[PDB]
Amino acid sequence: QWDRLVLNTPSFPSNYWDKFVKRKVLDKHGDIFGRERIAELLGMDLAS
Amino acid sequence: VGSEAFQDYVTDPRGLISKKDFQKAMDSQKQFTGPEIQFLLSCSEADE
Structure with missing residues (x-):
């Protein structure tokens, strides 16, 4: 329940080797549960 | 159908879904x- 704060932050994968975990989640679960919902949950800008 | 993105495309109050909406969803x-x-x-x- 506490980890939800860090999902939509722009600096989630800091002190972690990869920085594209957001994009991998969007590519994996985006087309089932909703790409726009993934963007809202992860604080992602699809055009940007 | 159990997925929630399909529920996103569903819009009619009485249930149901247009054939075009079904196609794109x-x-x-x-x-x-x-x-x-x-x-x-x-x-x-x-149905008609």
Whole structure:
């Protein structure tokens, strides 16, 4: 329940080797549960 | 159908879904090809 704060932050994968975990989640679960919902949950800008 | 993105495309208050909405929603899930999409449309009840 506490980890939800860090999902939509722009600096989630800091002190972690990869920085594209957001994009991998969007590519994996985006087309089932909703790409726009993934963007809202992860604080992602699809055009940007 | 159990997925929630399909519930996003569903908009009529009484349940149900337009054939065009069905086509684009089941295309956005990106699991069925064009022929299978049309076959599901054919197998649907397709009430007037």
